[PDB]
Design a protein around this ligand. Structure first.
Ligand SMILES: *[C@@H]1O[C@H](CO)[C@@H](O[C@@H]2O[C@H](CO)[C@@H](O)[C@H](O)[C@H]2NC(C)=O)[C@H](O)[C@H]1NC(C)=O
Ligand SMILES: *[C@@H]1O[C@H](CO)[C@@H](O[C@@H]2O[C@H](CO)[C@@H](O)[C@H](O)[C@H]2NC(C)=O)[C@H](O)[C@H]1NC(C)=O
Lengths: 50, 92, 50, 186, 26, 78
């Protein structure tokens, strides 16, 4: 995927909603994070009751 | 069930003279009287719902006090018993 | 819904050992420390509440 | 006919308002440093003080962001965090400006009705802690991996659940009824 | 007097039975 | 006269006592009805959900392919 664009020299700086994890930090280098966030559940829900 | 509800009631409590007491305990003058009676009914309904809400309004080893020692609680057991052995092995 | 399950922030990725890592990270950190990050956040996300 | 429907509607309204107020209770405060009140302490009733303990990252940030606020907040607690918390609980201190993690743990552990402001989600300049090591040291590459490898698992999450906890989740009135009766009688 | 206490008692009974029923029938 | 009185007290000698008791019973009934409606009106979680821990065909727990979430899911045991 898009990491091929960085490792294979296609690009030189990956700017995207990139999440920090193990092997990605292993192969390429990161910077200090600019937005903290986690993983969350999205579910459709109907609130009102007639 | 004593003095559990009348906290704000007495504070806000502050031919017509008998009619006011009657409708409290139940031309434009009649319209005003009817509106006042409706307001009193709404007020007493709010009072009963408030008392209902007021009436409507401790865990295992997972308790943070049971996990982080606290001086407000004396979590004591039987000395030299099996519970002491079980507690002696885990880390926290 | 759900409690956050992976509390790792985002990141601006780049090729390993590139000379820009120190400068990119430092500038991102300075802007984040300054009001620039919060300003860019408010005008672009969390601006709607229905 | 009309009266039966009227009493049914009254019953429905009573039940609806009961369930309305029963599942309805929330506490909120000022928006934080974004407010003009925090930007401009000099008001009709100026804030008592702002508890920014010096020699820290908070002091540097607040000095390099709002010099007037930093100068005004000189009435800050010197000794430690606990003294400032006790003083605020008593009432001399108006508001406390400090590190998010320590303040959040203190709120989640300390008893009483003291709560952190709604800026928990809207924390200002969220940077995060770290393990500083010597400049250009070879230890950067392993630790950067290892600690990160801790994060992509249940290790750090469970450890945080273990050490920093306490409950008292940082989430009642009657004068609104008096306001309603005043408005209706008006 | 009597009627005010009567309506207060009726309100208390309604609230009490509501809170009672909120946790019945298992 | 009782035919209109029944409707009136529903919408509100021993004969008067019986009427008063019937009115009280009707009031108790309507109070029970409003409390019933109140109770009826008064009457989804994270990765800890048993469906999210034990696979189930009633739920399609899907994510973005090849994304970071797949990596996070690939390492843990269950
Ligand atoms: C990273 O930032 C530093 C700091 O500005 C850059 O160092 C400067 O480089 C210019 C051009 O070579 C010099 O004129 C300055 O005197 C340097 N200043 C310092 C403090 O070193 C450096 O070039 C930047 N590197 C990259 C890859 O962007
Ligand atoms: C921040 O650091 C300064 C520098 O030491 C502290 O100033 C000292 O304060 C103590 C207690 O009042 C005095 O006995 C020293 O003489 C002071 N030293 C200097 C050089 O002024 C200051 O207290 C610190 N602020 C804190 C801990 O909140």
């Amino acid at each position: 995927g898009m990491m091929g664009e960085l490792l294979s020299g296609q690009a030189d700086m990956i700017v995207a909603p990139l999440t920090i994890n193990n092997e990605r930090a292993q192969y390429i280098e990161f910077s200090k994070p600019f937005k903290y966030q986690g993983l969350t559940i999205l579910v459709k829900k109907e609130i009102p009751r007639s | 069930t004593l003095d559990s509800f009348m906290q704000p009631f007495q504070s806000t409590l502050w031919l017509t003279l008998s009619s006011a007491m009657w409708f409290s305990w139940g031309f434009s003058a009649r319209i005003l009287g009817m509106v006042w009676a409706g307001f009193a009914m709404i007020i007493v309904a709010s009072y009963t719902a408030n008392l209902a809400a007021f009436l409507v309004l401790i865990t295992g080893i997972n308790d943070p006090r049971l996990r982080n020692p606290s001086d407000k609680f004396i979590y004591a057991t039987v000395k030299q018993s099996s519970v002491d052995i079980y507690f002696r092995r885990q880390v926290c | 819904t759900g409690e956050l399950f992976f509390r790792s922030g985002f990141g601006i990725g780049m090729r390993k050992d590139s000379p820009w890592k120190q400068n990119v990270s430092l500038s991102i950190l300075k802007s984040h420390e300054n009001g620039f990050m919060e300003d860019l956040d408010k005008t672009w996300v969390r601006y709607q509440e229905c | 006919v009309f009266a039966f429907f009227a009493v049914i509607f009254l019953a429905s309204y009573t039940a609806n308002l009961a369930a309305f107020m029963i599942q309805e209770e929330y506490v909120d405060t000022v928006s934080g440093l974004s407010d003009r009140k925090f930007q401009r302490p000099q008001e009709q009733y100026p804030p008592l003080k702002f508890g920014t303990v010096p020699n820290g990252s908070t002091e540097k940030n607040i000095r390099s962001n709002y010099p007037d606020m930093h100068s005004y907040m000189v009435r800050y607690n010197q000794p430690r965090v606990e003294e400032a918390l006790t003083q605020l609980k008593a009432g001399k201190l108006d508001a406390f400006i400090y590190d998010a993690a320590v303040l959040n743990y203190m709120a989640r552990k300390d008893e009483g009705c003291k709560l952190v402001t709604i800026g928990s989600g809207k924390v200002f300049a969220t940077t995060g802690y770290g393990i500083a090591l010597h400049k250009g040291s070879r230890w950067k590459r392993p630790i950067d991996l290892a600690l990160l490898q801790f994060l992509g698992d249940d290790e750090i999450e469970m450890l945080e659940r273990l050490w920093l906890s306490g409950i008292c989740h940082n989430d009642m009135s009657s004068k609104l009824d008096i306001d309603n009766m005043a408005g209706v009688f008006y």
